[PDB]
Amino acid sequence: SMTSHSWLCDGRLLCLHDPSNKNNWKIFRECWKQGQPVLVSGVHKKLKSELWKPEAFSQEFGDQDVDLVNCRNCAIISDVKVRDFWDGFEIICKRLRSEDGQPMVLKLKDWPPGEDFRDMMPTRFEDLMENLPLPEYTKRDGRLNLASRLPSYFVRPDLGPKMYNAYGLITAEDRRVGTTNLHLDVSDAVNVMVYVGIPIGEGAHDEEVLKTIDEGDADEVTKERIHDHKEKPGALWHIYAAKDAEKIRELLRKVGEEQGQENPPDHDPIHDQSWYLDQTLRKRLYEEYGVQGWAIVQFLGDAVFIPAGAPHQVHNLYSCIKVAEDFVSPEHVKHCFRLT
């Protein structure tokens, strides 16, 4: 039967089921005030699916110049055409190859660039902004979004949204790599999975995806969305409470020293955006520092709410198109204040 919500991460994560329900705020706001992330499913059913396909982005914008990142080694591929990324999104025999002759796992950097999403893609902008969940928090002029209402004593987010496009990580060695490394934001954010591309060529890659989710610490109910409902999984997230950020910095300073990095005692390994917490590091954070996180699988049409100050990392299972909007809730405005 249809219900309003469920609890994932062994009861520790709210999952809303109706993205446009006028009463969602009554369930949301208590979890949000406690500094927890929230998942909202079903946003893909509200969108115009023809606007969010890789072949359309290639046809309309393919002649623009961009830089890519090689996810495996962080090498920058400079000044290529954006069609060279899009045409390899799902079809493995079209991907740029490294010198070993293997197809690369690539991330499309800063595209559309800076604040240009609205100017470059006005119809996509309308379709996304009109269908964001919790609109009093997430719309540019929502009553509970302080972004447009704060003086210069607060760090204000750029004008959004921002698009995040990258291929899926494939191999057993790839399990230790991030799509986006561990970092934090001083604003709140909502991140929507608008498209998941499951390839063909090296298609039959189902098995390494299940081992990644299982070793990723995903709960038993999350494993049921695959086997029972056949939903498309996009990306594995780990999110940590804002209150645990300094304990994470202590672990990463100790590990940086063990690995012969030579860092001053005060340097900030989260701001550096240079670490991915693999199974070994996540277990060491729990056992040695007492810190538990949330392991979240973001399926097609899931919106992940990330609280200001919360350290988080992202590992794509398949090729993903994500679109994110920043906002400033009253619950978490302390995180962007420039004094004390």
Ligand X SMILES: CC(C)(CO)NC(=O)Nc1ccc(Cl)cc1
Residues that constitute the known binding site for Fe cation? 183, 185, 312
124 binds, among Mn ion, Cl ion, ligand X, none (CB under 5 to 8 A by kind): Cl ion
Residue matched to tokens 């277990």: 283
105 binds, among Cl ion, Mn ion, ligand X, none (CB under 5 to 8 A by kind): none
Query: How far is Cα 324 from Cα 161, in angstroms, rounded to an integer?
Result: 5
The answer to the question of residue 41 lying near ligand X (CB under 6 A) is: no
Query: How far is Cα 167 from Cα 71, in angstroms, rounded to an integer?
Result: 9
Query: How far is Cα 302 from Cα 286, in angstroms, rounded to an integer?
Result: 27
What string marks each residue from 171 to 190 as x (binds Mn ion by CB under 5 A) or -? --------------x-----
Contact stretch for ligand X (CB under 6 A) within 16-24, 192-200, 206-214, 241-249: 16-24
| Three-state secondary structure call for residue 300 | coil
Pairing verdict, β 13-16 and 38-40: parallel
At residue 301, what is the residue type? G
The answer to the question of residue 136 lying near ligand X (CB under 6 A) is: no
2 binds, among Cl ion, Mn ion, ligand X, none (CB under 5 to 8 A by kind): ligand X
Q: How far is the CB of 106 from ligand X (least distance, A)?
A: 38
Position closest to Mn ion via CB: 185
Kindly list the distances between the CA atom of residue 172 and the CA atoms of 45, 176, 211, 282, 304, in Å, as whole numbers in the listed order.
33, 8, 9, 17, 26
At residue 72, what is the residue type? R
Of 6, 18, 46, 146, which one interacts with ligand X (CB under 6 A)?
Answer: 18
Residue 134: DSSP 8-state: S
Cβ-based nearer residue to ligand X, 13 or 177: 13
Angle at 298 between CA 171 and CA 125, to 5 degrees: 115
Query: Using CB under 5 A as the criterion, which residues of the chain lie in contact with Mn ion when the complex forms?
Result: 185
Query: Using CB under 6 A as the criterion, which residues of the chain lie in contact with ligand X when the complex forms?
Result: 2, 4, 18, 21, 23-24, 26-27
